[PDB]
Model the fold of this input.
Amino acid sequence: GPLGSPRNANDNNQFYQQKQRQALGEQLYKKVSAKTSNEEAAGKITGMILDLPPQEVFPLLESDELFEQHYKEASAAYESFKKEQEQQTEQA
Done:
């Protein structure tokens, strides 16, 4: 890394490894939908756990314990939102 590297970058672009950012980040979403492919379900909790930055979320989305806590509060909403989803019911 930038520790033992002779030539250092001029511009500090943190948005370099975008493929990695969405990579582990996607883990946040799939971790929720791990019980179902409910885009409205995991999308609900994902927004809650979306408080952790792209990379800062990686360490969380990879730890079961770290998820349970964060996904905990969001979980309770999981049922309510997935059950009382009277908003996703488009009328004619």
Summary: The chain has one domain: 1-92. Residues 64-83 form the longest helix (20 residues). Helices lie at 18-32, 39-48, 54-61, 64-83.
